[PDB]
Amino acid sequence: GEMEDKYKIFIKNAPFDPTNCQIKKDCPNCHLDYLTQICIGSQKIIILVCRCGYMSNRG
Amino acid sequence: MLIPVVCFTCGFPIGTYAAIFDKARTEYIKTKMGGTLPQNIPLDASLQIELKDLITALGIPMRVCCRTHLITTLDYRKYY
Amino acid sequence: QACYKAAEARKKGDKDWEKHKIPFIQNTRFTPQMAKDILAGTLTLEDLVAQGICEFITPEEA
Ligand SMILES: [Zn+2]
Numbered sequence: 588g589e590m591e592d593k594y595k596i597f598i599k600n601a602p603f604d605p606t607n608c609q610i611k612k613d614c615p616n617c618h619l620d621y622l623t624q625i626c627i628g629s630q631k632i633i634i635l636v637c638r639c640g641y642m643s644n645r646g
Numbered sequence: 647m648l649i650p651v652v653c654f655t656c657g658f659p660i661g662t663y664a665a666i667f668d669k670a671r672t673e674y675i676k677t678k679m680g681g682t683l684p685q686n687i688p689l690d691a692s693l694q695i696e697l698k699d700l701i702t703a704l705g706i707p708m709r710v711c712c713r714t715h716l717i718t719t720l721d722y723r724k725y726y
Numbered sequence: 727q728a729c730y731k732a733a734e735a736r737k738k739g740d741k742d743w744e745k746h747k748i749p750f751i752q753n754t755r756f757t758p759q760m761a762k763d764i765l766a767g768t769l770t771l772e773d774l775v776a777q778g779i780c781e782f783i784t785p786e787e788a
Pocket residue numbers: 614615616617618619637638639640641
């Protein structure tokens with residue numbers, strides 16, 4: 588399975604990589620205007636992450 | 647290595663005015679820039695000065711070919 | 727910081743929380759005067775690097 592140990596480091600770094608795509612969406616935790624979106628794997632799972640530590644799908 | 651004696655395309659004798667044209671163009675471009683170093687004058691900026699009326703004053707007609715060859719020909723004395 | 731302060735007004739109960747936000751701005755520091763100085767010979771690449779207007783990038787860092 589993915590999203591757990593295959594890309595744990597990348598997913599934890601995704602908010603800080605400046606070459607990652609952003610999305611104009613408010614953050615529930617820190618109330619930030621923008622979020623970081625990623626799309627990993629052949630199932631194209633969409634994960635939204637934040638600098639404060641927020642992450643979609645109960646991260 | 648010089649401006650041709652005649653126009654390559656039609657044969658009009660553009661070369662009887664070549665020396666006058668070269669010197670007069672030098673003076674005219676210097677007047678338009680206003681006394682600047684030859685290297686501080688960009689090659690691009692001096693080529694945008696219109697030489698229509700200077701060529702007209704030489705007596706050369708309004709032919710596309712003659713003005714092309716009088717304006718664009720490279721001089722070997724300025725490269726060696 | 728303006729986003730955080732707008733949120734601080736928003737949660738506490740201010741109905742004008744969104745007026746604290748500022749617009750985002752991104753730009754380069756290269757100016758038309760620098761281009762003019764380059765064409766005049768008074769400005770160089772190693773002088774543009776010296777004040778951090780440009781930098782060198784290899785395919786690794788790209
Ligand atoms: Zn957040």
